Amino acid sequence: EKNVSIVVAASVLSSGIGINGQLPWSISEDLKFFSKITNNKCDSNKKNALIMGRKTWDSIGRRPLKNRIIVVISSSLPQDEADPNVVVFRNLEDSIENLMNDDSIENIFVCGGESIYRDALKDNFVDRIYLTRVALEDIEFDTYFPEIPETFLPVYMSQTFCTKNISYDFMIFEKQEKKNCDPARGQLKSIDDTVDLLGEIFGIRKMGNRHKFPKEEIYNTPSIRFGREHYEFQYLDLLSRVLENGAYRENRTGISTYSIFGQMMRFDMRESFPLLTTKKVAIRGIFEELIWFIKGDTNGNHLIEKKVYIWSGNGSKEYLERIGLGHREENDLGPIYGFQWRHYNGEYKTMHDDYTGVGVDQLAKLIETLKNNPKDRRHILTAWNPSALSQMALPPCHVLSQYYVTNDNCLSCNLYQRSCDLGLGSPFNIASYAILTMMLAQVCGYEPGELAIFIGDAHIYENHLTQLKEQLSRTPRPFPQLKFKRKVENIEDFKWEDIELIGYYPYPTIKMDMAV
Amino acid sequence: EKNVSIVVAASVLSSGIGINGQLPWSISEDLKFFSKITNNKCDSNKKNALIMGRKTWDSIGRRPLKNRIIVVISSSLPQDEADPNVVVFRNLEDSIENLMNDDSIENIFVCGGESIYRDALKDNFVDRIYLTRVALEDIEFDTYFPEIPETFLPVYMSQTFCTKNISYDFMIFEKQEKKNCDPARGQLKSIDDTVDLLGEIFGIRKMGNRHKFPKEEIYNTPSIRFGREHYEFQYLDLLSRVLENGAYRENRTGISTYSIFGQMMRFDMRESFPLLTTKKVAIRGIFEELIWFIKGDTNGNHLIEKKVYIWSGNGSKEYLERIGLGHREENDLGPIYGFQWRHYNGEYKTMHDDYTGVGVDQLAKLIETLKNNPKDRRHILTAWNPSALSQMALPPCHVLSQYYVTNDNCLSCNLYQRSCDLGLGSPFNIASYAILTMMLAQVCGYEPGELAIFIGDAHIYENHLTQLKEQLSRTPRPFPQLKFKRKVENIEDFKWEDIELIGYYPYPTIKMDMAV
Ligand SMILES: NC(=O)C1=CN([C@@H]2O[C@H](COP(=O)(O)OP(=O)(O)OC[C@H]3O[C@@H](n4cnc5c(N)ncnc54)[C@H](OP(=O)(O)O)[C@@H]3O)[C@@H](O)[C@H]2O)C=CC1
Ligand SMILES: NC(=O)C1=CN([C@@H]2O[C@H](COP(=O)(O)OP(=O)(O)OC[C@H]3O[C@@H](n4cnc5c(N)ncnc54)[C@H](OP(=O)(O)O)[C@@H]3O)[C@@H](O)[C@H]2O)C=CC1
Ligand SMILES: C#CCN(Cc1ccc2[nH]c(N)nc(=O)c2c1)c1ccc(C(=O)N[C@@H](CCC(=O)O)C(=O)O)cc1
Ligand SMILES: C#CCN(Cc1ccc2[nH]c(N)nc(=O)c2c1)c1ccc(C(=O)N[C@@H](CCC(=O)O)C(=O)O)cc1
Ligand SMILES: CN(Cc1cnc2nc(N)nc(N)c2n1)c1ccc(C(=O)N[C@@H](CCC(=O)O)C(=O)O)cc1
Ligand SMILES: CN(Cc1cnc2nc(N)nc(N)c2n1)c1ccc(C(=O)N[C@@H](CCC(=O)O)C(=O)O)cc1
Ligand SMILES: O=c1ccn([C@H]2C[C@H](O)[C@@H](COP(=O)(O)O)O2)c(=O)[nH]1
Ligand SMILES: O=c1ccn([C@H]2C[C@H](O)[C@@H](COP(=O)(O)O)O2)c(=O)[nH]1
């Protein structure tokens, strides 16, 4: 029948595609994509046609595109014979007669101009859309990509890439007419039927039935079945798995959860920063807690003083009293994360004491082994100290991490987290250890690698159900970028002002109460 | 023309299906499977036909099967019109006219007798094979399932199930005809080509390019693309993953490996024991090293005396020397795990010293919490004590573990393993911590749950390449069962003889040298 597909690069929030007759931006990988995509064909004796409005024709210098035939739509341009790789038409519908004839034309692409896009869509001429989402807002646009008609559904979203600090995506939308998101399903009737029957026979007894694929009403952007490349699906899909399989269970806080044991999440950090886009995340507070950790600081007031209250709850007199630490000052949390990082096995007295020299400095050693022996398999940082647990406001959650220097020269990080509050703590942990890995990488002379998080008790607190369903209804946007303004000499030296968060265009923040 | 599939239950090694006119076993779930499968149909106005040899007809008492038509092949049986649900034919070929006609007959099943299977396969009448593999050998068989023709390929392998301590699967075989083993690829031209093109543009900058799908020549039983349910694939595919992506890198050993970071494996422990069948695995030494840890013993002699030599290489006078620990008696391994399990943070001297009372007894604490506070999110056991690494013959590989009591009353286990020798240590760790979980579960009144292994440095030593590729050429068999003959009072009371390993029919041992 001959496929007709739109190909465009529009800004993530406004769908801005042009300014004063030009592109709002310069991203070569995107042009390479345009070239590969429009050039891609089966028959060597055929060519693809690239339809475009006249202004776009002007915008590219009125020079032909190799191996392809350009079809310009113009009421004024003359139909001449000079170039046989460029041809003119008076309206879109007529040019569409690439279909009813030229058998030398394999595929058709609508290659843009807002005016051309809008018609092709209005008149139901396109089957597919290749959308390069560019994280560039707050800049002038005078040309837009129309809003994608509801008859289209996304089927692929690649990971975030980066060019000159600009984050971008690649999505594919397909028009689906007439008529499970599980990839290993709907593949072969006999396999699906057999597994289904085996499941009826055994019950909880078949491990698969303990790991049911999420029903679509809890599956984010469910139409994307085989192309969920964007690594934010790694967190959304874990949410879906616990919403689908979570056992309902009581716990120390009195606010029950839905709980599954033993999931994982991997995020790339070479091209982008894993800061969730489906909800606005408080990154300043994350950074402050991280730096607070690095300095082996356990004084909660230092956090509060900077208007960061994540540790207030577990620092209160009331709480400290409840767990048997009524002897502490307000906000003395005991030998937690920071202390175990800088002074492992050190004898904790109070937050006011000087501990320089005491305990084992894991962090310092980590940076030394990382520099001097990179391929060593012992780059570990731990916070689990059986002898210190009872003195901690809260036992270590992000419990152990290990660090792996690539042959590429990048720093990758693994973290086991015994207990993970998916709504409120996970987004934090992900970003936090993404930042730490980048800080470690800079002081050791490496580039950021990959981040993998392995979870024990992965749960959602029962008062976050409607909030996370809300979140799950939001399709993800390209991840932002995070850059350091200066190269520090000591990891303890980083400051908020040193952090540059580039291109973060999240959805509204979603309120969620933390369980004390 | 419609579908003809075989349904058979045969023993793992010899494919025995009968003895003295009956089955060698009684596994009701398999009868339930047989029933689901041969009853399975779309058109509510048609029925399926089950073809069987006369002897099989005798073996089921000559009583019709509900909702189905039974086709008996016999030279002697009278062709009566009496029961419209049972029909007789003089030969298998004539019977196949179920195709040509009886549009009441939706699908056809060859339901067996060795004589009937062997004919159906020889004359090319069957398209599919449903094959329940039973782990029973060393019992009498007089009837067998023919050897599956090479024109058939395996497309599914369920997990191992257990009935009356008998391990069993089911798997599907499909007949091949003309025509990527990757699940997500091959679903849409548009998506595969986009991902491909994107890969070309970005190269190593696209995470996916850093985790390529393994090429078939190194992927176990590649024809099974969407049905690799047998949890032995969790191990085998990790092997395949590093063969395909592993980075060549040197290490302290002197024997270079191939390395990838952050991987995971999952194993069920409810229906079976995860002891690799693609190679014979030494379970006894494993158990002996395990019970050794449990007791807190750091004395390497005790294992040698029991003829277990896994800790010799790293306990010799020459080795303890190269790492500056010669002031130590030979085979005095220092406070590794065991000491860390029973006396975490205790002050270590020699192995002969009496440590009762020193250090934190994590194991004891574990068991007392698993009992009194199952839902607790802190069941942790750690062996990574920075304050003690210097004096350990070797730093801890299986570094931390977490334990999770389901509402189902089972005990699941998570282990982070900083470094993992895939050819030598991994098969051991999977079994080791499987056993430890069953021990803990018996002792605490629970049933075995699931086992997940999170790995940091996942590698293969370069001298194991031939052995591993050999292993990768062996198709998995059902896992064996592992039961305790008695209920111990304390976990320190387990003894080799208390363990009954039922139904293990591994492939031959594969010799692999351990890098010191
Ligand atoms: N990021 C991206 O993906 C892309 C962005 N762009 C940007 O978009 C902008 C150009 O888009 P836009 O401003 O909409 O201009 P267009 O490229 O749509 O071209 C408009 C011209 O096309 C002809 N035309 C349009 N409709 C008709 C019709 N119904 N009948 C006959 N001729 C018609 C007219 O030419 P005439 O006056 O001769 O009749 C009109 O002047 C530029 O800034 C460009 O940089 C362009 C392509 C891609
Ligand atoms: N594990 C499993 O899935 C199954 C196992 N079994 C076991 O298999 C055994 C039975 O198999 P088997 O011993 O091979 O006997 P079969 O069940 O295959 O039946 C053999 C009979 O079928 C008829 N027959 C066979 N070939 C022909 C032919 N070419 N022309 C005409 N009639 C033919 C003959 O009946 P006649 O004498 O009337 O000519 C022959 O005696 C039993 O022990 C049963 O328990 C059976 C089914 C399934
Ligand atoms: C992990 C971690 C760090 N931590 C430490 C921390 C301490 C105790 C915890 N307790 C529980 N039950 N869950 C947690 O995630 C948790 C986290 C956090 C603590 C609180 C919040 C939280 O309340 N966040 C709110 C705050 C709003 C804001 O940041 O301005 C949020 O909206 O996100 C986040 C992180
Ligand atoms: C994990 C662990 C325990 N350990 C501890 C241990 C210590 C140092 C190591 N060093 C290296 N490089 N790899 C290891 O797996 C390793 C394992 C083991 C050590 C050796 C064998 C081993 O060589 N087994 C032989 C033969 C012994 C047998 O047949 O029983 C084998 O061929 O399988 C297994 C486990
Ligand atoms: C019409 N237009 C505007 C433009 C710019 N970027 C886009 N990007 C996308 N994703 N989609 C578009 N339609 C698109 N259009 C174009 C078209 C072609 C070239 C161009 O130079 N193309 C060469 C570029 C090749 C290269 O640089 O590697 C080609 O090979 O097709 C530039 C702008
Ligand atoms: C021919 N035969 C021997 C037998 C036994 N086990 C097998 N198992 C398998 N997987 N495949 C076979 N062909 C097979 N055949 C049979 C056939 C039917 C029944 C039988 O009782 N079937 C009932 C069983 C119903 C039930 O137990 O739930 C049915 O509904 O089909 C027993 C033995
Ligand atoms: O870095 C952190 C700190 C705490 N929590 C959450 C996990 C649990 O919801 C709660 C800890 O409670 P316990 O598992 O100790 O009961 O705080 C996190 O998710 N990440
Ligand atoms: O349970 C274990 C014990 C040791 N090893 C292997 C992993 C490495 O091959 C080697 C440890 O080397 P280092 O991490 O110390 O470099 O021992 C395992 O795989 N599993």
mmCIF file with all atom_site columns, N, CA, C and O in Angstrom, chain A residues 29 187 205-206 210 231 249 262 266 268 271 344-345 377 402 405 416 450, chain B residues 187 205 207 210-211 229 249 262 266 268 271 344-345 387 402 405 407 416:
data_model
loop_
_atom_site.group_PDB
_atom_site.id
_atom_site.type_symbol
_atom_site.label_atom_id
_atom_site.label_alt_id
_atom_site.label_comp_id
_atom_site.label_asym_id
_atom_site.label_entity_id
_atom_site.label_seq_id
_atom_site.pdbx_PDB_ins_code
_atom_site.Cartn_x
_atom_site.Cartn_y
_atom_site.Cartn_z
_atom_site.occupancy
_atom_site.B_iso_or_equiv
_atom_site.pdbx_formal_charge
_atom_site.auth_seq_id
_atom_site.auth_comp_id
_atom_site.auth_asym_id
_atom_site.auth_atom_id
_atom_site.pdbx_PDB_model_num
ATOM 1   N N  . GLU A 1 29  ? 23.467 14.317  15.572 1.00 0.00 ? 29  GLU A N  1
ATOM 2   C CA . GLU A 1 29  ? 23.007 12.932  15.636 1.00 0.00 ? 29  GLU A CA 1
ATOM 3   C C  . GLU A 1 29  ? 21.584 12.890  15.093 1.00 0.00 ? 29  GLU A C  1
ATOM 4   O O  . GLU A 1 29  ? 21.215 11.929  14.405 1.00 0.00 ? 29  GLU A O  1
ATOM 5   N N  . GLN A 1 187 ? 3.461  -14.266 21.328 1.00 0.00 ? 187 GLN A N  1
ATOM 6   C CA . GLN A 1 187 ? 4.512  -14.635 20.380 1.00 0.00 ? 187 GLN A CA 1
ATOM 7   C C  . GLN A 1 187 ? 4.179  -15.929 19.647 1.00 0.00 ? 187 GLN A C  1
ATOM 8   O O  . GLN A 1 187 ? 4.378  -16.047 18.437 1.00 0.00 ? 187 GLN A O  1
ATOM 9   N N  . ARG A 1 205 ? 2.232  -22.206 43.182 1.00 0.00 ? 205 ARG A N  1
ATOM 10  C CA . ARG A 1 205 ? 3.283  -23.181 42.940 1.00 0.00 ? 205 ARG A CA 1
ATOM 11  C C  . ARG A 1 205 ? 4.113  -22.924 41.693 1.00 0.00 ? 205 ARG A C  1
ATOM 12  O O  . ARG A 1 205 ? 5.246  -23.394 41.610 1.00 0.00 ? 205 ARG A O  1
ATOM 13  N N  . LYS A 1 206 ? 3.563  -22.201 40.717 1.00 0.00 ? 206 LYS A N  1
ATOM 14  C CA . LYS A 1 206 ? 4.342  -21.890 39.515 1.00 0.00 ? 206 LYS A CA 1
ATOM 15  C C  . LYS A 1 206 ? 4.904  -20.500 39.760 1.00 0.00 ? 206 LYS A C  1
ATOM 16  O O  . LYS A 1 206 ? 4.151  -19.539 39.893 1.00 0.00 ? 206 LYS A O  1
ATOM 17  N N  . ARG A 1 210 ? 3.699  -15.964 40.665 1.00 0.00 ? 210 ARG A N  1
ATOM 18  C CA . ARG A 1 210 ? 4.064  -15.108 41.795 1.00 0.00 ? 210 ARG A CA 1
ATOM 19  C C  . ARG A 1 210 ? 4.644  -13.807 41.248 1.00 0.00 ? 210 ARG A C  1
ATOM 20  O O  . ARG A 1 210 ? 4.859  -12.833 41.971 1.00 0.00 ? 210 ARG A O  1
ATOM 21  N N  . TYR A 1 231 ? 14.997 4.666   30.343 1.00 0.00 ? 231 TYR A N  1
ATOM 22  C CA . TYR A 1 231 ? 15.368 3.909   31.533 1.00 0.00 ? 231 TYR A CA 1
ATOM 23  C C  . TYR A 1 231 ? 14.564 4.363   32.747 1.00 0.00 ? 231 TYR A C  1
ATOM 24  O O  . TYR A 1 231 ? 14.768 3.872   33.857 1.00 0.00 ? 231 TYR A O  1
ATOM 25  N N  . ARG A 1 249 ? 1.245  -6.066  53.714 1.00 0.00 ? 249 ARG A N  1
ATOM 26  C CA . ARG A 1 249 ? 1.825  -6.357  55.017 1.00 0.00 ? 249 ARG A CA 1
ATOM 27  C C  . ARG A 1 249 ? 2.079  -5.202  55.978 1.00 0.00 ? 249 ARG A C  1
ATOM 28  O O  . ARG A 1 249 ? 2.425  -4.093  55.575 1.00 0.00 ? 249 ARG A O  1
ATOM 29  N N  . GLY A 1 262 ? 12.884 -8.600  45.888 1.00 0.00 ? 262 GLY A N  1
ATOM 30  C CA . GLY A 1 262 ? 14.094 -8.930  45.158 1.00 0.00 ? 262 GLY A CA 1
ATOM 31  C C  . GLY A 1 262 ? 14.049 -8.463  43.717 1.00 0.00 ? 262 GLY A C  1
ATOM 32  O O  . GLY A 1 262 ? 14.169 -9.264  42.790 1.00 0.00 ? 262 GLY A O  1
ATOM 33  N N  . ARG A 1 266 ? 18.200 -0.659  36.449 1.00 0.00 ? 266 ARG A N  1
ATOM 34  C CA . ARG A 1 266 ? 19.475 -0.157  35.948 1.00 0.00 ? 266 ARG A CA 1
ATOM 35  C C  . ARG A 1 266 ? 19.260 1.147   35.177 1.00 0.00 ? 266 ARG A C  1
ATOM 36  O O  . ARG A 1 266 ? 18.269 1.312   34.473 1.00 0.00 ? 266 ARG A O  1
ATOM 37  N N  . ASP A 1 268 ? 21.338 4.407   32.925 1.00 0.00 ? 268 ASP A N  1
ATOM 38  C CA . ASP A 1 268 ? 22.549 4.838   32.258 1.00 0.00 ? 268 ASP A CA 1
ATOM 39  C C  . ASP A 1 268 ? 22.896 6.222   32.768 1.00 0.00 ? 268 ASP A C  1
ATOM 40  O O  . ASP A 1 268 ? 22.008 7.010   33.079 1.00 0.00 ? 268 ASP A O  1
ATOM 41  N N  . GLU A 1 271 ? 25.038 9.177   28.995 1.00 0.00 ? 271 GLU A N  1
ATOM 42  C CA . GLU A 1 271 ? 24.308 10.182  28.241 1.00 0.00 ? 271 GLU A CA 1
ATOM 43  C C  . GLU A 1 271 ? 23.384 11.088  29.080 1.00 0.00 ? 271 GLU A C  1
ATOM 44  O O  . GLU A 1 271 ? 23.016 12.163  28.608 1.00 0.00 ? 271 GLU A O  1
ATOM 45  N N  . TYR A 1 344 ? 34.070 4.021   60.087 1.00 0.00 ? 344 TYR A N  1
ATOM 46  C CA . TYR A 1 344 ? 33.489 2.709   60.365 1.00 0.00 ? 344 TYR A CA 1
ATOM 47  C C  . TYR A 1 344 ? 34.011 2.137   61.694 1.00 0.00 ? 344 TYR A C  1
ATOM 48  O O  . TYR A 1 344 ? 35.202 2.256   62.033 1.00 0.00 ? 344 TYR A O  1
ATOM 49  N N  . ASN A 1 345 ? 33.135 1.467   62.425 1.00 0.00 ? 345 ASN A N  1
ATOM 50  C CA . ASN A 1 345 ? 33.537 0.879   63.698 1.00 0.00 ? 345 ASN A CA 1
ATOM 51  C C  . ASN A 1 345 ? 34.059 1.896   64.688 1.00 0.00 ? 345 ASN A C  1
ATOM 52  O O  . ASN A 1 345 ? 34.751 1.541   65.636 1.00 0.00 ? 345 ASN A O  1
ATOM 53  N N  . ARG A 1 377 ? 38.641 -5.820  42.389 1.00 0.00 ? 377 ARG A N  1
ATOM 54  C CA . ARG A 1 377 ? 37.255 -6.217  42.575 1.00 0.00 ? 377 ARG A CA 1
ATOM 55  C C  . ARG A 1 377 ? 36.758 -6.042  44.000 1.00 0.00 ? 377 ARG A C  1
ATOM 56  O O  . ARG A 1 377 ? 35.848 -6.749  44.435 1.00 0.00 ? 377 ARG A O  1
ATOM 57  N N  . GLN A 1 402 ? 29.138 -1.041  45.494 1.00 0.00 ? 402 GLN A N  1
ATOM 58  C CA . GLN A 1 402 ? 30.425 -1.442  44.940 1.00 0.00 ? 402 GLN A CA 1
ATOM 59  C C  . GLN A 1 402 ? 30.631 -0.861  43.545 1.00 0.00 ? 402 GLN A C  1
ATOM 60  O O  . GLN A 1 402 ? 29.671 -0.628  42.811 1.00 0.00 ? 402 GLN A O  1
ATOM 61  N N  . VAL A 1 405 ? 35.350 0.078   37.515 1.00 0.00 ? 405 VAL A N  1
ATOM 62  C CA . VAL A 1 405 ? 35.959 1.016   36.573 1.00 0.00 ? 405 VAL A CA 1
ATOM 63  C C  . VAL A 1 405 ? 36.043 0.292   35.253 1.00 0.00 ? 405 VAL A C  1
ATOM 64  O O  . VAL A 1 405 ? 36.650 -0.758  35.152 1.00 0.00 ? 405 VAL A O  1
ATOM 65  N N  . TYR A 1 416 ? 23.028 -2.423  46.741 1.00 0.00 ? 416 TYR A N  1
ATOM 66  C CA . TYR A 1 416 ? 21.981 -3.176  47.420 1.00 0.00 ? 416 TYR A CA 1
ATOM 67  C C  . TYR A 1 416 ? 21.253 -2.307  48.442 1.00 0.00 ? 416 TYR A C  1
ATOM 68  O O  . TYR A 1 416 ? 21.880 -1.661  49.280 1.00 0.00 ? 416 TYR A O  1
ATOM 69  N N  . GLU A 1 450 ? 27.384 3.308   34.487 1.00 0.00 ? 450 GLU A N  1
ATOM 70  C CA . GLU A 1 450 ? 26.002 2.852   34.628 1.00 0.00 ? 450 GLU A CA 1
ATOM 71  C C  . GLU A 1 450 ? 25.686 2.670   36.104 1.00 0.00 ? 450 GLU A C  1
ATOM 72  O O  . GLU A 1 450 ? 26.584 2.465   36.911 1.00 0.00 ? 450 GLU A O  1
ATOM 73  N N  . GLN B 1 187 ? 9.581  -8.127  16.351 1.00 0.00 ? 187 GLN B N  1
ATOM 74  C CA . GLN B 1 187 ? 8.186  -7.822  16.606 1.00 0.00 ? 187 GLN B CA 1
ATOM 75  C C  . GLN B 1 187 ? 7.604  -6.795  15.646 1.00 0.00 ? 187 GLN B C  1
ATOM 76  O O  . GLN B 1 187 ? 6.429  -6.869  15.285 1.00 0.00 ? 187 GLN B O  1
ATOM 77  N N  . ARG B 1 205 ? 27.812 4.587   22.762 1.00 0.00 ? 205 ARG B N  1
ATOM 78  C CA . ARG B 1 205 ? 27.078 5.591   23.528 1.00 0.00 ? 205 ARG B CA 1
ATOM 79  C C  . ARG B 1 205 ? 25.638 5.156   23.819 1.00 0.00 ? 205 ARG B C  1
ATOM 80  O O  . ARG B 1 205 ? 24.951 5.767   24.639 1.00 0.00 ? 205 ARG B O  1
ATOM 81  N N  . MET B 1 207 ? 23.471 2.552   25.566 1.00 0.00 ? 207 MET B N  1
ATOM 82  C CA . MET B 1 207 ? 23.600 1.487   26.558 1.00 0.00 ? 207 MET B CA 1
ATOM 83  C C  . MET B 1 207 ? 23.320 0.109   25.963 1.00 0.00 ? 207 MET B C  1
ATOM 84  O O  . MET B 1 207 ? 24.077 -0.836  26.182 1.00 0.00 ? 207 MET B O  1
ATOM 85  N N  . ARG B 1 210 ? 26.017 -1.781  24.803 1.00 0.00 ? 210 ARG B N  1
ATOM 86  C CA . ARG B 1 210 ? 26.947 -2.273  25.809 1.00 0.00 ? 210 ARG B CA 1
ATOM 87  C C  . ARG B 1 210 ? 26.436 -3.579  26.429 1.00 0.00 ? 210 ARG B C  1
ATOM 88  O O  . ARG B 1 210 ? 27.092 -4.200  27.251 1.00 0.00 ? 210 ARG B O  1
ATOM 89  N N  . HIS B 1 211 ? 25.233 -3.964  26.040 1.00 0.00 ? 211 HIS B N  1
ATOM 90  C CA . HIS B 1 211 ? 24.612 -5.178  26.519 1.00 0.00 ? 211 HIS B CA 1
ATOM 91  C C  . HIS B 1 211 ? 24.013 -5.800  25.276 1.00 0.00 ? 211 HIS B C  1
ATOM 92  O O  . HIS B 1 211 ? 22.801 -5.772  25.102 1.00 0.00 ? 211 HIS B O  1
ATOM 93  N N  . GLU B 1 229 ? 11.892 -20.842 30.529 1.00 0.00 ? 229 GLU B N  1
ATOM 94  C CA . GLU B 1 229 ? 11.333 -20.756 31.866 1.00 0.00 ? 229 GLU B CA 1
ATOM 95  C C  . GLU B 1 229 ? 12.127 -21.542 32.912 1.00 0.00 ? 229 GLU B C  1
ATOM 96  O O  . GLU B 1 229 ? 12.096 -21.226 34.098 1.00 0.00 ? 229 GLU B O  1
ATOM 97  N N  . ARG B 1 249 ? 40.071 -8.311  30.963 1.00 0.00 ? 249 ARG B N  1
ATOM 98  C CA . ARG B 1 249 ? 40.784 -7.580  31.985 1.00 0.00 ? 249 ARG B CA 1
ATOM 99  C C  . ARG B 1 249 ? 41.587 -8.432  32.968 1.00 0.00 ? 249 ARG B C  1
ATOM 100 O O  . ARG B 1 249 ? 41.137 -9.483  33.438 1.00 0.00 ? 249 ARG B O  1
ATOM 101 N N  . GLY B 1 262 ? 27.266 -5.668  37.438 1.00 0.00 ? 262 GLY B N  1
ATOM 102 C CA . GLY B 1 262 ? 25.840 -5.608  37.720 1.00 0.00 ? 262 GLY B CA 1
ATOM 103 C C  . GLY B 1 262 ? 24.924 -6.563  36.958 1.00 0.00 ? 262 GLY B C  1
ATOM 104 O O  . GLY B 1 262 ? 24.313 -6.179  35.962 1.00 0.00 ? 262 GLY B O  1
ATOM 105 N N  . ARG B 1 266 ? 17.848 -15.544 39.231 1.00 0.00 ? 266 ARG B N  1
ATOM 106 C CA . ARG B 1 266 ? 16.696 -15.881 40.055 1.00 0.00 ? 266 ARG B CA 1
ATOM 107 C C  . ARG B 1 266 ? 16.489 -17.390 40.039 1.00 0.00 ? 266 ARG B C  1
ATOM 108 O O  . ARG B 1 266 ? 16.723 -18.023 39.018 1.00 0.00 ? 266 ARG B O  1
ATOM 109 N N  . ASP B 1 268 ? 13.844 -20.684 41.771 1.00 0.00 ? 268 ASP B N  1
ATOM 110 C CA . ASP B 1 268 ? 12.755 -21.077 42.643 1.00 0.00 ? 268 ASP B CA 1
ATOM 111 C C  . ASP B 1 268 ? 13.305 -22.130 43.587 1.00 0.00 ? 268 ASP B C  1
ATOM 112 O O  . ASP B 1 268 ? 14.206 -22.881 43.225 1.00 0.00 ? 268 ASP B O  1
ATOM 113 N N  . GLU B 1 271 ? 9.529  -25.717 44.341 1.00 0.00 ? 271 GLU B N  1
ATOM 114 C CA . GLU B 1 271 ? 9.322  -26.983 43.676 1.00 0.00 ? 271 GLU B CA 1
ATOM 115 C C  . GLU B 1 271 ? 10.605 -27.803 43.460 1.00 0.00 ? 271 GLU B C  1
ATOM 116 O O  . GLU B 1 271 ? 10.518 -28.985 43.137 1.00 0.00 ? 271 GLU B O  1
ATOM 117 N N  . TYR B 1 344 ? 31.074 -11.380 64.522 1.00 0.00 ? 344 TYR B N  1
ATOM 118 C CA . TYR B 1 344 ? 31.335 -10.115 63.847 1.00 0.00 ? 344 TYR B CA 1
ATOM 119 C C  . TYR B 1 344 ? 32.019 -9.122  64.780 1.00 0.00 ? 344 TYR B C  1
ATOM 120 O O  . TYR B 1 344 ? 31.527 -8.844  65.874 1.00 0.00 ? 344 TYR B O  1
ATOM 121 N N  . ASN B 1 345 ? 33.155 -8.592  64.342 1.00 0.00 ? 345 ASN B N  1
ATOM 122 C CA . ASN B 1 345 ? 33.826 -7.515  65.061 1.00 0.00 ? 345 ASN B CA 1
ATOM 123 C C  . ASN B 1 345 ? 34.570 -8.019  66.292 1.00 0.00 ? 345 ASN B C  1
ATOM 124 O O  . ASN B 1 345 ? 35.068 -7.230  67.095 1.00 0.00 ? 345 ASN B O  1
ATOM 125 N N  . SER B 1 387 ? 37.167 -3.292  59.167 1.00 0.00 ? 387 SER B N  1
ATOM 126 C CA . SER B 1 387 ? 38.131 -3.388  60.258 1.00 0.00 ? 387 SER B CA 1
ATOM 127 C C  . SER B 1 387 ? 38.900 -4.710  60.274 1.00 0.00 ? 387 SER B C  1
ATOM 128 O O  . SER B 1 387 ? 39.892 -4.832  60.994 1.00 0.00 ? 387 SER B O  1
ATOM 129 N N  . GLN B 1 402 ? 20.055 -11.027 52.541 1.00 0.00 ? 402 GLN B N  1
ATOM 130 C CA . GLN B 1 402 ? 18.828 -10.569 53.181 1.00 0.00 ? 402 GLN B CA 1
ATOM 131 C C  . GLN B 1 402 ? 17.708 -11.593 53.023 1.00 0.00 ? 402 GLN B C  1
ATOM 132 O O  . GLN B 1 402 ? 17.611 -12.267 51.998 1.00 0.00 ? 402 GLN B O  1
ATOM 133 N N  . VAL B 1 405 ? 10.384 -13.268 54.785 1.00 0.00 ? 405 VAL B N  1
ATOM 134 C CA . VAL B 1 405 ? 9.391  -14.295 55.117 1.00 0.00 ? 405 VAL B CA 1
ATOM 135 C C  . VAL B 1 405 ? 8.120  -13.851 54.397 1.00 0.00 ? 405 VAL B C  1
ATOM 136 O O  . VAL B 1 405 ? 7.617  -12.764 54.664 1.00 0.00 ? 405 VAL B O  1
ATOM 137 N N  . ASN B 1 407 ? 4.031  -14.015 53.090 1.00 0.00 ? 407 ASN B N  1
ATOM 138 C CA . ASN B 1 407 ? 2.755  -14.171 53.820 1.00 0.00 ? 407 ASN B CA 1
ATOM 139 C C  . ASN B 1 407 ? 2.345  -15.618 53.653 1.00 0.00 ? 407 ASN B C  1
ATOM 140 O O  . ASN B 1 407 ? 1.489  -16.137 54.356 1.00 0.00 ? 407 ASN B O  1
ATOM 141 N N  . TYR B 1 416 ? 23.975 -10.358 47.618 1.00 0.00 ? 416 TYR B N  1
ATOM 142 C CA . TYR B 1 416 ? 24.933 -9.618  46.805 1.00 0.00 ? 416 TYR B CA 1
ATOM 143 C C  . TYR B 1 416 ? 26.305 -10.284 46.828 1.00 0.00 ? 416 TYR B C  1
ATOM 144 O O  . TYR B 1 416 ? 26.844 -10.582 47.894 1.00 0.00 ? 416 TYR B O  1
#
